């Protein structure tokens, strides 16, 4: 369930797992259903904070992503230790009303005390149902 | 299966389901794990709105509940029509850092355009792990 994502920092993200998706094949996101993911990254800094920013665009238009807790330290053992690897598991609820699209770009950026912790761009999600 | 809840509105909620939980038996919420829930209710009003408020109390102290999308219309087809029954499914991510407790009270109120859509109090959840 390892999926291909584009790193946009310095390869801190080691592996992104989405059950039911793989590699660079179209990863189908079904409206109204849970979407599970798991990510393993290495901390590039000692940091008390880990804050998530998500940007999604559907056919080139930016859309709000509801239901995300911005504080990643709620789901991990902060503070983070430089050189250690952390695992985060999260289930996102796909809105029943999300616009269908075959051209989806998701950018997630994680900020710590001393700058970006992790950055990934995912281009293979498709929203259907 | 079906779990037991106290209604605090006018019996609009028909059934609450949590997998692995039964009636009034201790329903165990695990730290750092997904908590799945399903509910069917009957709309008592025509409404384009349906906004959720949660309050949680742990051993008699209120604690903030993160990771909740207050717009319930994201997970249903609003507007709602009076007299129709709706089903909502939602997976909540239990914070890794949630205080452990055997005395947990959860109160969920749903508010529509012209008044309370639904209200339930749940007293059998325990936070462990």
């Amino acid at each position: 369930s390892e999926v291909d994502v584009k790193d946009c920092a310095n390869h801190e993200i080691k592996k992104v797992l989405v059950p039911g998706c793989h590699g660079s094949e179209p990863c189908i996101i079904h409206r109204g259903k849970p979407f599970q993911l798991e990510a393993v990254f290495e901390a590039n800094q000692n940091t008390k904070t880990a804050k998530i920013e998500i940007k999604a665009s559907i056919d080139g238009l930016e859309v709000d992503v509801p239901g995300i807790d911005p504080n990643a330290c709620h789901y991990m053992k902060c503070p983070l230790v430089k050189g250690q690897q952390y695992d985060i598991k999260y289930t996102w609820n796909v809105p029943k009303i999300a616009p269908k699209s075959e051209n989806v770009v998701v950018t997630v950026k994680v900020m710590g005390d001393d700058g970006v912790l992790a950055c990934a761009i995912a281009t293979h999600a498709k929203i259907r149902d």
Side-chain angles (χ1 to χ4, degrees), chain A:
Chain A
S1 66
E2 187 176 349
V3 293
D4 301 352
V5 301
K6 173 176 171 305
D7 193 86
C8 29
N10 189 223
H11 299 99
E12 296 84 352
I13 292 174
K14 300 318 175 185
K15 60 180 57 181
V16 177
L17 299 312
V18 177
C21 299
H22 77 96
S24 292
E25 291 214 280
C27 180
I28 311 308
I29 293 183
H30 304 274
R31 292 159 126 203
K33 287 182 175 186
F35 178 74
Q36 322 166 220
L37 78 137
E38 180 181 350
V40 308
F41 70 100
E42 177 176 300
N44 69 5
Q45 61 182 267
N46 302 301
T47 185
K48 293 164 188 148
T49 65
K51 311 312 149 214
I52 297 156
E53 300 170 44
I54 306 182
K55 183 162 295 171
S57 77
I58 277 73
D59 298 297
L61 290 176
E62 189 174 291
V63 66
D64 186 58
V65 182
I68 301 302
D69 179 356
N71 191 342
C73 288
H74 282 346
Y75 316 103
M76 296 175 306
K77 50 294 196 78
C78 296
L80 302 183
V81 177
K82 178 165 172 172
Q84 291 206 215
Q85 288 200 353
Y86 296 93
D87 173 279
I88 178 160
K89 286 203 265 301
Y90 198 81
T91 304
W92 184 60
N93 297 281
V94 187
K96 199 159 223 319
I97 240 61
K100 291 188 273 205
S101 175
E102 298 296 315
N103 177 206
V104 182
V105 182
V106 181
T107 305
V108 352
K109 291 199 284 304
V110 184
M111 308 285 189
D113 297 334
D114 303 321
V116 292
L117 276 160
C119 184
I121 294 158
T123 62
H124 301 116
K126 314 293 171 185
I127 297 164
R128 339 226 255 224
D129 277 24

